[PDB]
DNA sequence: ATTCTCCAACCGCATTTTC
DNA sequence: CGAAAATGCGGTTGGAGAATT
């Protein structure tokens, strides 16, 4: 168990940075094996995907996404890739964590 | 001081890929 | 070929930061 885990640092945010910028995505098992990073490929490869990408938005969900979301959940049940691939901008984890703290409690 | 909220990231598991 | 490694998913929760006593 030499893997690190729990909150990225920034220190870490920036060499998986510069590791998917000069290399793109995917085989993420070789990052910790190429830089200094002590993380998983699993721990990376999540990291990339809901913070460092470019193409995850940032701000709260509007209303119109909470209404999207009510709907598509109403459509597919707890499906949230399948749900978060007609959200542009949010993640499955996202999609699923707003529907859990936020919608769930309706 | 302590309790609460919320969500980033973990776990276990199934599917896919590698060699 | 097929055992191990890697990917991807959804449920769950540790703990940072916010709120309360
Ligand atoms: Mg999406």
């Not at 990225?8 to 998986?16: G, N, Q, R, S, Y």
């Not at 990339?48 to 979301?69: A, C, H």
Request: charge should be positive.
């Amino acid at each position: 168990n030499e893997y690190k885990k729990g909150l990225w640092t920034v220190e870490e945010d920036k060499i998986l940075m510069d590791y998917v910028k000069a290399h793109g995505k995917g085989h993420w098992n070789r990052i910790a094996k190429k830089t200094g990073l002590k993380r998983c490929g699993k721990s990376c490869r999540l990291r990339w995907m809901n913070y460092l990408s470019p193409n995850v938005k940032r701000g709260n969900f509007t209303e119109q996404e909470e209404d999207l979301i009510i709907r598509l959940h109403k459509l597919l049940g707890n499906r949230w890739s399948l749900i978060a691939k007609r959200v542009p901008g949010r993640t499955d984890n996202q999609v699923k964590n707003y529907w859990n703290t936020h919608l769930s409690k309706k």
